[PDB]
C-alpha cells in the first residue's frame with residue numbers, strides 16, 4: 001500500500017526521483033521551461049549534471065517526507081504551506097502540481113510494480129487542495 | 138523532449154524511418170512521383186524492396202543530425218543549404234517538406250511513445266523557413 005510505496009521509492013530514491021521527473025517532463029514537455037538548465041539536454045546528459053540528480057532527489061525526498069507525515073493520504077497543512085512559500089515555487093500554480101501527479105500516477109501504473117496508484121492519485125488531489133488553501137493561485 | 142526524441146529515434150532508426158516515410162507517402166500518395174519504383178506497392182512490398190529501407194534510413198540519419206545540430210529546434214543554415222543544394226532535391230519546393238512534417242507530427246501524436254510532437258512541429262517550420270532563406274522555392 002501507500003506506506004510500502006514510500007519504502008520502495010526511498011529504497012532507490014535517486015532512480016525513482018529521476019525516472020518520475022523525466023516522465024513528468026515527457027508527458028508535459030512545456031513544463032521544462034521552469035528548469036532552464038535542462039533545455040536541449042538528452043536524458044543521459046541530464047544525469048551527468050550534478051544539480052539534476054541532486055535537486056531531483058531533494059524534491060522527491062521532501063515528497064516522501066510529506067507523504068509519510070500524511071494521515072490516510074491527507075497531507076499536513078504545514079507541509080503544503082512549505083511548498084507554497086518556497087522561493088523556487090513562486091511562479092507555480094496548482095496546475096503544475098496536478099500535472100506532476102498525473103504523470104506520477106501514470107508512471108506507477110505502467111511500472112513492473114506493485115504501487116498503490118489509487119492512493120498516490122488521492123494524495124495528489126489532497127495536496128492540491130491544501131496548496132490552494134495555503135494561497136497557491 | 139526534443140533532444141531525447143532524437144536519441145529515441147536513433148535507437149530504432151530503421152523502423153521509425155520506414156514507419157514515418159510510409160505515413161508520409163500514405164497521407165500524400167501524390168508525393169510518390171518524386172521517387173522511382175514506389176508506385177503500385179503496398180507498405181510490406183516497399184519494405185522488402187532492395188533500396189527502400191536503405192534510402193529511408195539515409196534520409197533519417199541526416200534528419201536526426203540536422204535536429205541534433207539545432208539549438209532550440211532552429212537548424213543550422215549550412216544544414217539547410219545542404220538540403221537545398223543536394224542534386225536529389227533539385228525538383229523540390231518547401232511544400233514537400235511541409236507535408237513530410239505534417240505526417241511526421243501526426244505519426245508522433247498517434248504513437249505509443251511519448252514524443253514531444255509540438256517541438257517537432259516547430260522544428261519542421263524552422264527548417265522550412267531555413268530552406269526558404271537558403272533559396273528553395
Ligand code: HEM
Pocket residue numbers: 168171172173191192195196197199200203220225226229233234237
Ligand atoms: C529534412 C528532410 C530531408 C532530409 C534530411 C533528406 C535527406 C536525403 C538524403 C540523405 C538522401 C540520400 C539517400 C541516399 O543516398 O541513399 C535523399 C535523397 C532523396 N530525397 Fe530527401 N531529405 C529530406 C526531405 C525530402 C522530401 C520532403 C522529399 C520529397 C517529398 C525528398 C526527396 C528525395 C528524393 C527523391 C531522393 C533521392 C531518391 C531516393 O532516395 O529515393 N527528400 N534525401
